[PDB]
Amino acid sequence: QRWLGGMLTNFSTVHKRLQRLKELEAMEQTGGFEGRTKKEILMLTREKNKLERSLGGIRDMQKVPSAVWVVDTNKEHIAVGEARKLGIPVIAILDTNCDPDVVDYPIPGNDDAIRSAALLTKVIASAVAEGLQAR
Amino acid sequence: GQKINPHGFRLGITTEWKSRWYADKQYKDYVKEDVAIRKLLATGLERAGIADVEIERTRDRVRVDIHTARPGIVIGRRGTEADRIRADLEKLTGKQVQLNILEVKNPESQAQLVAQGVAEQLSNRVAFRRAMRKAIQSAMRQPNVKGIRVQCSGRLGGAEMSRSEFYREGRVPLHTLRADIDYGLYEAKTTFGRIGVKVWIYKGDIV
RNA sequence: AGCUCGUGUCGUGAGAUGUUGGGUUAAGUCCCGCAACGAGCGCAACCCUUGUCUCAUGUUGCCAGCACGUUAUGGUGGGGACUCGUGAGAGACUGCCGGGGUCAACUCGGAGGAAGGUGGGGAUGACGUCAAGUCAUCAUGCCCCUUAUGUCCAGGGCUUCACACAUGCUACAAUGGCCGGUACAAAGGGCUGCGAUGCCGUGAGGUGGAGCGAAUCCUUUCAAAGCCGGUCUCAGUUCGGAUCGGGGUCUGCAACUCGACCCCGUGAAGUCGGAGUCGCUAGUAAUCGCAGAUCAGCAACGCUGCGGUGAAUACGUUCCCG
RNA sequence: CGGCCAACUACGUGCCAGCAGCCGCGGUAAUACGUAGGGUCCGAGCGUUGUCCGGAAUUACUGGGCGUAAAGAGCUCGUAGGUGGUUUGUCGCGUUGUUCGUGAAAACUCACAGCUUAACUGUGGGCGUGCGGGCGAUACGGGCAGACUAGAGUACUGCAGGGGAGACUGGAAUUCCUGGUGUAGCGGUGGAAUGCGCAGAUAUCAGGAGGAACACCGGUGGCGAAGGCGGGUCUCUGGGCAGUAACUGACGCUGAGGAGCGAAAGCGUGGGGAGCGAACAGGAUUAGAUACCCUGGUAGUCCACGCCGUAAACGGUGGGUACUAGGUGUGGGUUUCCUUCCUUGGGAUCCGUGCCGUAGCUAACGCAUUAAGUACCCCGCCUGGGGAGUACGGCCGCAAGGCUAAAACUCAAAGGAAUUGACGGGGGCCCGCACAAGCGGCGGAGCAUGUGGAUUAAUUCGAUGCAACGCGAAGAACCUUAC
Fold it and tell me: Residues in domain KH type-2 (chain B)?
């Protein structure tokens, strides 16, 4: 959806969001939708939706990402900058308008096509899948 | 004049009256004897933290209950302290006066005791930042404390210019009626004047 | 309706971002975006009162249906029915419908309802500003007085008056004045206090004391504006009441300085007020009366409340103020 | 004995007495004044004053700068000087190695020795950074004798242009004059009045005279060293660019002084004079208007020939050269390929002129292949702010004045950029009995109450825009009560 500025650098703060999301899932499981005012429960449901929508793959962040795979570094310059600040290696597919000085492991190619980016994601997913196979 | 006294805001809702009796013709003299009792107890005892004094009356017999953080100090092992307070409460024309000395469960969660301690530390030599930080940390360490604000003003540190300083931790919703805000005010005696310490402590809400 | 903080990011740094942008709201209220992610004090809600209904409830409060009443009436035996009093609860949540809307906030209209979109009014006043006010409520550092700047007493003063300013009340009248008759309130107070019937004065009032710690008795059974009738006939007047003369009442040790009220007489300015300026959007303004605190008495026309009768106007933000 | 900068309390005093190198301390509770305790630093010394160096990179050779902080001459040409592409041979001037002579002693430095130690004294080295003579080297600089064509210039072929000077000439409009028509206003402003007209104005038509400036084209477009330059035509004349590379063969760059050009205003002599318009007159506004606004209006603006020599003469950025990512407009010219070859087709290239942006630089703003980046050569200039670009002297000028250019004294700053507020007779969007629409009032009268002022023995004290003034006072005859 959208890169919250400072997931990697401000990790401790954004982990509280996952804690709150889990707390609200527990509240959903127990069924506390009638114990308070309708405005409060409606706002709570909206907060649930916003937090789960903005953080889809973030619920598994235990320590830090050991590497970052990014498409169209120009669009998400904040994420690449955060990795560079933290020193986490970044693997990117760079288009002809990108800067090769910021990525470590470039893969030249197009990112404006859904098919090319999809194929590159297939390749990286195969790599990580086999690596998780060979643990 | 900014904020009304938190106890008086919730007097009929959350907090309770500290004097319990009914009088129609004898309201005025009852009030007089109550304030006399209160000032006597305030002057006589200063070592043990006197958090609260309740007075109950019924015809001849008068029941006064006080809460302190050091009950042993104010009570005589042979009743010597009890003897003195009993006799000089008889002298207050109280007819039959009986005392129920009590102890507070969590001295650090009581606003009056916290303010008393902060002011006592302030009086001798302590820098005010140290006192406020220590009080805030000690109170937040307690289980029920959800928020504490400490504010003291005056010639802090013996300065020529008066200042007001305050630190807060957690939630202190002064405008919320159901929230119970424990309020404590006590004046620190220093060589350069008088320093006033106000403490607000918030511990959940009562519905 | 704003004021900040933690972490992160930008900057050598003061600092910035969040808190900006679009929309929306009474609101930093919310939604969508966004190097920011969250949090705190504020906003809102929780409290009181008021508007509807349900259950409980019958005395000192009601009396519809029954009996006794004597004019004097719930007055009396009786009765929960209707009010009312006070406990609990329900009830308004954009809940529903239709349309705008990013299918989001939000917004317009409709139904139901006593009430519709924070229903009305309260309490609640963020960080701070103005060295704002208060050493005369109180407390307090320092300085000063201490045969006095402490302390007791009598008398006087705080009420002085050529003026100036400010807030009010009463008027300048006929949408009124006077006289007679007559109808409707709420709220509150009362023990060495409220004080009734009766009697005596013209009237303040005097004597007397029934009953009342009071939903019971007293404040009259409570009002005035209101309505009906009569008179006045546009005048400095039957308007207006100041000032002054004489005579009294009450409180109080004592009304000279310096109280209030009553009676007879006196009858001033004042003909709707320049420049300029104030309050108020509905049970409001205007107007009418009632009560309370302080209080022996009162300078109360002040202040804090209560009810009666009850309007006009808002096209719209160019100008004035914040 | 406040901080710099080791070392603090009490008493006395109170914006005084005083202290102080700077910042600055004295306002009944001073670690800054004075005195006592205590302390610290030195010690037969310890402080003050005077003078020099250091700190000061603050005259910067080592070792600074000039867009906005002080600092690029207004711009060119050029003298002396400084500096100079590739290459061959030679000289050994600079440069470099070695050697000899000299560089007195003393001093300094190293070692040793003698005074009981030290200061001091002596001895032996080094030092004496230099100069002179001999000998060696030739990379670099220089000289000499050549060579080359990449710099520089010429030739030829094209090209664009408000580059400049002179002469002649066009039309619109303003003004005026004459003659018709034609009436009672015109003109001007936020609103008016002076003013013009009724003796025929303004308006409209025809004719005539004169001067100045050249709408559209016409722009962040062209040319010029800069100032600057556009109505048309003709004559004379300067520079630039591109291509070919035929020619010469380093002929280059900069340039102290010096010379020339140099907006506007101003000055002299002679013409011209429509419009505009300093000065000057009235009118108006205003408390006052020596102004802004209006009606008039003289120098001047224009031409010829000469002076002057200044400007925010600014890109606030001296000239030459080489190198350092790109993207996109636009002006001039050559060329290959899409090729219709019509077409900004597109590319490449050379010369300009803008915008955006890297690296890098900068205090920041910003600059950024047109540098304020990286370097080399030459020139001008700066050294805290006022006094002052002034006085004195000098030179130039008809004059106005310009150029060169101090000191005394005085201050502890003056400055640049940027941040947060506050403010604006800045902009945008909103609100509130804020205005507008209404109703009732206050300001006039009489009285009540509070306050100021005055008065008194005393009129106790407090409260002074909103947010003091029927406020503290929810009750002053005595009490209250403080006078």
Answer: 37-105
